[PDB]
Amino acid sequence: ATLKDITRRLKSIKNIQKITKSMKMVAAAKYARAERDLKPARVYGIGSLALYEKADIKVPEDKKKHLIIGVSSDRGLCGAIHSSVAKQIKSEVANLTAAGKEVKIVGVGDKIRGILHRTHSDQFLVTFKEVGRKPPTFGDASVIALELLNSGYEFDEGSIIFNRFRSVISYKTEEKPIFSLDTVASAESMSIYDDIDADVLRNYQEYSLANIIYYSLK
């Protein structure tokens, strides 16, 4: 309650305000470029998934477990971006374990690994790093997909969770299914296509995985 304490406390906040004010413009400048490149990638991402849309494919009741993928960055100060994804990641596993499967979780982004480490340390299969400092590219999705197949773990089902840009002031959390299993792909509705083979379908699922990963990051 002396004069010196008041002076020091005023002089600290005077600097904090200017630091935040200068940090706002950089995020606006980055958001402009981030918005610019979304449109060319949206059509590619939608075009990748047309086949699964036209011919409905439903997974059966098997026990090969899932492969849940969550996407985030390594930086904070972004409101509740990471918490929303980490909320649904732990919600799905309860339903999955109700049936009983050897589910594993793979997360790209350090914050996702940090938040859920305490209660789901064993289910972690592999994690990535160095995300968000520079804009993502297709090569990163290629590297992730390449490193994902070499794992000895095999799955019949899987899903990927991400935040979808809706407006400059709002966003929506959603997930998309993966039917990359060859056996479930070979169903009645696929009989219309009449130049297929096992090798061709294996390569086709291989490519669809990288396409979905790139679309989610962008």
């Binding site: 020091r8 406390r9 005023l10 002089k11 600290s12 600097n15």
Partner: protein
Amino acid sequence: PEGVRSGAGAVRDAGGAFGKKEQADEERYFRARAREQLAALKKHHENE
């Protein structure tokens, strides 16, 4: 000129929450690197 003008390092002079929060982060970050540097010193000296 009449008002209160701030300077450099005023955040760590008041000794509030932000000063100690600032100090602990530097302490951790530079506590991490010394292990790698010592391990590389031992490997270098053992090699030659």
